[PDB]
């Protein structure tokens, strides 16, 4: 035995952490720096390009932050990319680009800066950013919101950033974290990035596996092999998707209805029920001990 640590005392004096800190989601240190505005700007927005990758998804949203709760103007998920051409490998870097680009075009059609601010159509991969036009409405500027990602080089986040940037959002960055950038040399290949953007780093993996061992390649790339998507059908495919995304981004939802409204969940037990149960439990205890 030992001194019990978590006594009444403990809990009495104990302060919870913020809810999303408790969840393990929001980094409040950054949130503050990121999100709140200068006061002499007053009410005017400060947008984000939220980018979050989830086990099988890539979510990219744009939000400023009102006191009630930060608001999403515009968002595109990975699992929308089927419409456009990407059928699998949707959590991967290339898809991130697609998502991030998508998000850009979608947002630039809403304000009607679709025809202005094309951005970068060729997909070089180089340092690019949007010079706002004069005699025209300016470019949309959001700052990247990386979450709890260790933001090394190669972090998919910077893919979706790239995508958006090439899509036509004025997001500040450096290239020091796109794939390519050589840590122990300090320049940038750009073509290396392009390859990652297009899936070649995936394609190459596929080829290396089929060479080495069929059973491993089949296990690794099942849904890739299914759908008939090869290493040599890949770069084209993404370029087609970017072309689809670029040409028609707007979202339509699904008209959800015909809901039965049954309670899957289990409702909370009313006082009297709870007050009953102990009555029963005490009575039950009494009748049991009145035998032996």
């Amino acid at each position: 035995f030992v001194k019990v640590v978590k006594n009444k005392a403990y809990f009495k004096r104990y302060q919870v952490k913020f809810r999303r800190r408790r969840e393990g989601k929001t980094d409040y240190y950054a949130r503050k720096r990121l999100v709140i505005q200068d006061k002499n700007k007053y009410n005017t927005p400060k947008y984000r390009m939220i980018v979050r990758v989830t086990n099988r998804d890539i979510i990219c949203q744009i939000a400023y932050a009102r006191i009630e709760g930060d608001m999403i103007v515009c968002a595109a998920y990975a699992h929308e990319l089927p419409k456009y051409g990407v059928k699998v490998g949707l959590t991967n870097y290339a898809a991130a680009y697609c998502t991030g680009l998508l998000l850009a075009r979608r947002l630039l059609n809403r304000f009607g800066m679709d025809k202005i601010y094309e951005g970068q159509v060729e997909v070089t991969g180089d340092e690019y950013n949007v010079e706002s036009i004069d005699g025209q409405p300016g470019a949309f500027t959001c700052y990247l919101d990386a979450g709890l990602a260790r933001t090394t080089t190669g972090n998919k986040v910077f893919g979706a950033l790239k995508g958006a940037v090439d899509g036509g959002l004025s997001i500040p960055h450096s290239t020091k974290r796109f794939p390519g950038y050589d840590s122990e040399s300090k320049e940038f290949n750009a073509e290396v990035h392009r390859k990652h953007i297009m899936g070649q780093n995936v394609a190459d993996y596929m080829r290396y596996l089929m060479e080495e061992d069929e059973d491993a390649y089949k296990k690794q790339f099942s849904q890739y092999i299914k759908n008939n998507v090869t290493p040599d059908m890949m770069e084209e495919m993404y370029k087609k998707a970017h072309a689809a995304i670029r040409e028609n981004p707007v979202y339509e939802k699904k008209p959800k209805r015909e809901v039965k409204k049954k309670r899957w969940n289990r409702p909370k037990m009313s006082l009297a029920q709870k007050k009953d149960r102990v009555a029963q439990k005490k009575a039950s205890f009494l009748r049991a001990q009145e035998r032996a």
């Binding site: 104990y14 505005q37 006061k39």
Partner: protein, 159 residues
């Protein structure tokens, strides 16, 4: 004689209250102060940059400047026998909108509503406030049961 140090005797003044330590909840920042907005200053331990001086805690004033993350904020300060209006730059964290004014405005808006209406009607309505009056004549019905007697009760030493 005492020390004239800046923070002297703010042990319980700038002290985040019980189970409210830690992170400054964002709303605080993301809410907006213009010129002419009335504000009650109130120091806060955590944010030290731009902490207002102890004399101006609780004291309440108007906002005459707005820098990136601060506000210049005219307050009054009685110095012996000559109140000084004076102007102090305070970081947002140690500052709240005063509600003192809101309730006046609410009442102005209500008057201007009740002025627009009841003009076409002809009846002039009592807009002014009026003090809590003498409490009117009225009956007390003691239905059936007569009022209960109350005997004063004997002393006995408890402890």
């Amino acid at each position: 004689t005492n020390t004239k140090g800046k923070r002297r005797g703010t042990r319980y003044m700038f002290s985040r209250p019980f189970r409210k330590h830690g992170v400054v909840p964002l709303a605080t920042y993301m809410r907006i102060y213009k010129k002419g907005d009335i504000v009650d200053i109130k120091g806060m331990g955590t944010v030290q940059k731009g902490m207002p001086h102890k004399c101006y805690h609780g004291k309440t004033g108007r906002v005459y400047n707005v820098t990136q993350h601060a506000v210049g904020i005219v307050v009054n300060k009685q110095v012996k026998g000559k109140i000084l209006a004076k102007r102090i730059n305070v970081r947002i964290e140690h500052i709240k909108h005063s509600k003192s004014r809101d309730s006046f405005l609410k009442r102005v808006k209500e008057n201007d509503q009740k002025k627009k209406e009841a003009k076409e009607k002809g009846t002039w309505v009592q807009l002014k406030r009026q003090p809590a009056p003498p409490r009117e004549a009225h009956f007390v019905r003691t239905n059936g049961k007569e009022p209960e007697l109350l005997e004063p009760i004997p002393y006995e030493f408890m402890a």
